[model samples]
Target: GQQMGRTLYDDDDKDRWGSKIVVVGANHAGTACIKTMLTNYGDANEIVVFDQNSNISFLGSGMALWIGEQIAGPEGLFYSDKEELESLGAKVYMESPVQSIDYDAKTVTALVDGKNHVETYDKLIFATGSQPILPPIKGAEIKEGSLEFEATLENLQFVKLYQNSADVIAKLENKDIKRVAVVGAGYIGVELAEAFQRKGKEVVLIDVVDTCLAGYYDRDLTDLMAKNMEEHGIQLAFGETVKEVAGNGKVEKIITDKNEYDVDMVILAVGFRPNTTLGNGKIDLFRNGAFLVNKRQETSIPGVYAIGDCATIYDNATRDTNYIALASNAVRTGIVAAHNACGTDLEGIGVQGSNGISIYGLHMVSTGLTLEKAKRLGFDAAVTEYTDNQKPEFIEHGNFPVTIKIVYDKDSRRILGAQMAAREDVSMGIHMFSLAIQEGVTIEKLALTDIFFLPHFNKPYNYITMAALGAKD
Candidate 1:
């Protein structure tokens, strides 16, 4: 079925390492790159994994609310298997982290197995993933009996503590935590709120926005999510400016302007800054300190590459680089960089900032620019939208209305950006607009198209045609 595309099932859920290649950072990009090498090459001894932690979940779809419940536990969490990896003859340096890399000499210095050693590599890939942003505030640290949690979720301690909770965890119970405060209304903050609510803990999820998901979505999309949070019994404190974090001993209360909120545990979802300083002065960095990488993930330094959260690739439509920091981007870039490193032919792909997440029961996804972003980029653009079934004449799946706005050059009608928010399988909209924006599709051309649609599958007035019609009108 061309429409149905690929099966969501039939997942093998394991990786085979190819060779004794050293991979730094055990997150999305690093894991994906390693898997690609193993799957393609097949001699596992050619691989070496040097990560700060001994265990990690490579495919993060396992962390989401809905996906986690549907899939196999710990099974979906793995990238490649140790037995399969070693069967291919690769050495697993579980608790090792690379301290420095000399690109000129192709050498990596790391603390491996509690011993500092140097390994000379035939090739090197820099996938040092991004770190969570932690704003300076008082009593941001928490020490519970013996457990400690830093502001960043990247810490193994926080991961262990969260995974070992009494609620859904199998390890150990958190001693005496009651209330939880999530300071950022972004993806992680929203998801953590859901986790806490599921654990039967009271939650106060707050942010600086008058609404949530302000960066990637319109007020309508965010409004729906806010309503969901309300339904789930999670307290929302929007537009509340933070002053400080003062406490009795360990993060007992949060101090905000004009008010105060108390909590037993706090997760600062304020956002993230790129993890670079490894390439600090070597690469041209954006104002926010994100690395400037091309579509190929190459930074300013030759033979050195950056991807995932650390690199902001070019937005071909915008001509300016931006950080999407997506799991998709990481996996693809890691493979691409490795291929390019090993000399494979592939077309260049840019970042779309495409992302989606579900809260309560509502699922939301967005791509490219919003109205705010188009205006900021000084483009003369308009947003055209549609609701209910796209093909209203033929479909009976209720009115799964979708709001999509195609941003374009006013004079030429070429699409510069797009925003999509819908309850339907919205990934199609995201993928469609990504191609349209990439190819510079015109508004008029978009309005009249050869989109093959079945009556039972959609309404004759499906989203893209309607949006194009709206744009033309």
Candidate 2:
């Protein structure tokens, strides 16, 4: 079962039983895929990885933590590196970006050290990941053929990469850049607002949407988060669209659709789009233009696969393929793709898009569809909300109020989504709801589900149980 003279390793005593797999992009998904292949499959496959970045496995989710000084430094932000992967038997090329692919011939051409390096593969894993979406705002245009801004604005930034985080940290040290305006009220926007505020800057958070985290949680939960931001002196400017960034080679003012305000810096956290230009029209794509991957993470082209933000995942709530960009989803998809690529048949069980966030000590976690999203998708969705103490009054030492909401189909009574918010670490409760959505568990069944009780931890009838019990037929 060997391709004669095609193996990267030429040792006579060594066993080469697998394919030459070329993995593009070595972030979360690509890293997971390589680790799974080498750890489980051994030296059977010759693995080669190419990443445009100098580093790997940087937890972009923790960037705000580092920016806000919640974490000491960026050293702990990265979990894996090129050296570690190389030690694991992967020939990793950092800063080597794949330029194009000849799918028919199973060949990949990448820019390694400013030279085109061609390599043929038996299988290709496409994990190009994603890039931050830069809205077409005036004075925020990028210069042609470069990452620099066209207007030469000094303080305008896009918060995505490790380098971007480092640049923001360096900018914050300048005493003149005090007032910050953050555009986009998503998770990153809110988190950055908190980060800048912690650094003692006057912050204003602007978003086109009227609510913060509208895509994830319903109004009830977002209302709490929005209030928390305001309580900490972070100005909320919802329902406003950023039209222009006016400055004299440095951020001086922000012009929104509704008003104009003086600002020292601007941070754009609009969203992200799939970076799947390598096999654009040649591969099947999701509605969002991401690679449409099956349960095995296989693309439309045989022997070619996609994973992570550049690919679509099977949404348990939708019961179909959909775009869900998250590190957790990326890693899971990579693992599934790796096994299948290495002669193993591992199928994905689907995902609920489980996610969590904490700002100013208020933690919120959610999964599946929000009530608004479920209804918008044409489902007869119903929701039940309950708020109570995490533990009984007798155990009053660390008692805190926790709010839980459950969303389900009105007719089928099957759980579709859930959200929880609390000052205490009630994040673990969201997992049960995530599993409930994944398993298609009915609200009635969850209410009667055997959940152990402890006076020191949760009440005999916890908020999750109470919320499910209160769901209407």
Candidate 3:
């Protein structure tokens, strides 16, 4: 009996991914796909990675952690290197920006070393990531800080600058960089404001919204963060939009709709937009302009996929597509695309939009939707806030005030989302809630879900249990 069964393409099940692959972008998504595919195929296929920057993660990389001094230095920021990836049997192209992609021909045109280099592939992945979104403020540089030298009134040339951590660190060393105006009260803005303030710089965080970290965490949590920011010597400039950046050949003052500020440096933590240049007419996009991807991370074009900040993934809480450009989601989708491309069947389940930030000696994490977001999305959402000590007072490390907020559907009692802020590490609580939301676990089940209470920890009631119990109260 002749069995028409398996083939080499059946690495996972199909052979459609072919042996030739090209990945564009070098951040979380590109590296994840390249590394995973190489690990699986192991010389069985040809893989090539391309990036416009000479190094991966160099653009906005270590800036955040560098502000907090968490990362040792600028060198520790980049996780992937060309030489290392080359050793893994994948061709690495640095300073290469993909100029165009031909779907019908399965070919990519890139600009490398000021020359056109054409690459053919059986499958393609776009990990192009995101670019900073600066408001239309006249005469202002898009972002602050510089790679060549720290940003200063004397050195800030009449050019656009997108400052990252390396620049921030360098500029902070100059005592003249005492006054800094940070635009946008988002996570990056707020955190960097704190970093600048911590470095003894007079930091002013300006935002259009009244609340800081709004939409990410609920209002109450952000209220505390806002108060903390002020208490720590950071100014809050809200309800204003920057009208212009005014200065002589450099940035010396910023004029907003409401007021003016004199500063030695500026940081634009406003937000980000997907680098949609390549996918402009080539792929389907959501209302926000992010690429629309299926469970396999495939774009509208066959044999082509998209990941990272450029694509939108399903949100289980909203039960709709969401554009969350976090590294966590990027890596997962990258691996999923790789597997599916390699003939295996894997789906991007969805994202909870999990996020965490540290400032004012507090660690805050959130997952799923906030109450405000849930209501705006037309969900009948109810919320409850719970407070408790993280651990018993006898344990010095665990004795810290922990606050929890749970947002759920009033009809189903199913937990829609959760947030935590604590002096102690409350990240685990957010993680548990993330899993609960993913598994469709109800608040009722979480209340009595047998969380072991060691005497070393605080009250026998874990924050989750306390939060669920208080939800009905």
Candidate number achieving the greatest lDDT relative to the actual structure: 2
Judge candidate 1 at residue 115 and give its lDDT.
85
Per-residue alpha-carbon lDDT of model 2 for 48-99, expressed as tens digits? 9999878878899778888889989988778888888898899998888888
Name the regions of candidate 2 deviating beyond 4 angstroms. Answer: 1-17, 147-152
Model 2 poorest ten-residue lDDT run: 1-10
Model 1: runs farther than 4 Å from truth? 1-21, 41-47, 64-75, 142-176, 283-286, 345-347, 390-399
Residue range 1-473, candidate 3, lDDT tens digits: 11122223336424344578899986678877777777776566798888876566443434655665666666655676788678877998887889898887788899888899999998888898777675678774433532222333442321112334545566567766768888889887887787678667898888999889997898888998999999988999988898877778767888899999997777766787787678749789877788888989998888888898888898878878889878888888888887777666777788898888888787899999999999999989998778877776667664777888999888888888999998767686678888888888877787878888886765777677878887762
TM-score, structure 2 vs. true: 0.95
Displacement of the residue 423 alpha carbon in candidate 2, Å: 0.9
- Candidate 3 global CA lDDT score: 0.77
Instruction: Estimate the TM-score of every prediction.
Output: 0.83, 0.95, 0.90
Cα lDDT listed for each candidate: 0.64, 0.87, 0.77
The better candidate by lDDT, 1 or 3, is 3
Report the lDDT tens digits of candidate 1 across residue range 1-473: 00121122212325522223566665677766665555554432366667665555445444434212444454545655445445544565765777777767777788877688788775556777775555666555434422123332211113222233212343114656677777888777788778778767788887877888887777777888888888989999989866666565456677776578877666666776776766637667777787777766766776566666777766756757777667787877877765544444344577667777776657776767776677777877677776655455435555566666676667778776676666656666577777777777788887886777777566566777777788743
